[PDB]
Amino acid sequence: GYMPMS
Amino acid sequence: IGWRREGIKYRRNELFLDVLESVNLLMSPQGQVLSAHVSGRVVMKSYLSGMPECKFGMNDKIVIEXXXXXRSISFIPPDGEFELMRYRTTKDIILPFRVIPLVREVGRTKLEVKVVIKSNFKPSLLAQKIEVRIPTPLNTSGVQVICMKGKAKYKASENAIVWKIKRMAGMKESQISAEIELLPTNDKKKWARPPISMNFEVPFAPSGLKVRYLKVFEPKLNYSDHDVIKWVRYIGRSGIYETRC
Ligand code: NI
Ligand code: NI
């Protein structure tokens, strides 16, 4: 699913 | 600009990137890749104040089909959801599943079929919506199946055994055994075994594509890149994913 972009 | 209006304002400047890929595979019974390619698009859903100059950075696994190309795309996005790019790959593809069929004939009456699927990806990731489709001959009078994981029905109308599995983590193995009861048939008619086909969904890009950054520069307005809340997700789905038995 949506994960924070690093 | 004909794709973006002038005075857009968001307290919460946020964006979402979708890497959406279809992986296609035709494999021989022994495990030779006869054909493999990925089709992908990147969809952006953006809620950014003003007229932001964006720069999308990836990792060059890709053959790309209004922006400005430089591994790196620069663009001012339209507000809301839009398609940033389409692409295709044939090289260095992650095949998420190996299908290993086994078919033994037993007189003119039984077909003994065992199918093993192996997940080839990180064990911390889950495939979902897995379906394994095993064709059965038209003179089929019945099917017995055993499978320790998931559920399987013989669907006579579709002439297939359909094995469904909700979840499967990477680096795992599962099998189904089927006994296909056969009716008498015209002798010269010999069965040409159609491929075993899969469907699945994986939370990574089979191409290998990685989003590295999406940088937002908006020179007039008083927010900057570290203010922008940024999300990415990968949805790899099967296209034609067939293994010859
Ligand atoms: Ni959204
Ligand atoms: Ni600041």
Author numbering:
A (entry chain P): 1 to 6
B (entry chain A): 159 to 223, 227 to 231, 261 to 435
Paper text:
Clathrin-mediated endocytosis (CME) is a major regulator of RTKs involving the heterotetrameric AP2 complex composed of large α and β2, medium μ2, and small σ2 subunits. AP2 binds to transmembrane cargo proteins that contain specific motifs such as YxxΦ (Y denotes Tyr; x, any amino acid; and Φ, bulky hydrophobic residue) serving as μ2 binding sites. In this study, we discovered AP2 is also an IRS-1-associated protein. IRS-1 binds with AP2 to prevent IGF-IR recruitment into clathrin-coated structures and thus enhance surface retention of activated IGF-IR.
